[PDB]
């Protein structure tokens, strides 16, 4: 969600209007105001095609975080637009481990809260204790208030 907003902070909206133009060219292919399973089929066999069905049924059932249950119009749009590659730095293992050192300042492989709190406070931007609640759910996959590294990894892998 948030990512949507940052990327739109990159560029402006007139762009989006001409996108809409491109799409009047495309938007043939909603069965349900959505672009769902049969629409995936329809607009993709438009050229006799469909995504690698891992992608396809993935969109059907899985990437529904919300309980959308289906490929919405939004979800087929999601695949078709996440096409062009732009993510930054996706930070991960060796990063996240050297980080985990001061994360688990404990020197133990099990972070405590306030080392992470310090890192949060000293990032350069906003720490919602909502998001800290998120992170306790996430980071400590054990959720025992103390995090083995890989837990923190998948908690922090793959993001700017």
């Amino acid at each position: 969600d948030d990512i949507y907003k940052a990327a739109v902070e990159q560029l402006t909206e007139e762009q989006k209007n001409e996108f809409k133009a491109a799409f009047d060219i495309f938007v043939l292919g909603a069965e349900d105001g959505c672009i769902s399973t049969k629409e995936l089929g329809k607009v993709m066999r438009m050229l006799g095609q469909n995504p690698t069905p891992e992608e396809l049924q993935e969109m059907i059932d899985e990437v529904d975080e919300d309980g959308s249950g289906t490929v919405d119009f939004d979800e087929f749009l999601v695949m078709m637009v996440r096409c062009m590659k732009d993510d930054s730095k996706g930070k991960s293992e060796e990063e996240l481990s050297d980080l985990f050192r001061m994360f688990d300042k404990n020197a133990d492989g099990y972070i405590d809260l306030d080392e992470l709190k310090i890192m949060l406070q000293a990032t350069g931007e906003t720490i919602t204790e909502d998001d800290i609640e998120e992170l306790m759910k996430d980071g400590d996959k054990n959720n025992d208030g103390r995090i083995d590294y890989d837990e923190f990894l998948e908690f922090m892998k793959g993001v700017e």
């Binding site: 560029l11 762009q15 491109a22 096409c83 062009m84 732009d86």
Partner: peptide, 12 residues
């Protein structure tokens, strides 16, 4: 993408 689109990809 570009292989399927052409020159419409210039600002990015």
């Amino acid at each position: 993408m570009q292989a399927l689109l052409g020159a419409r990809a210039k600002e990015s």
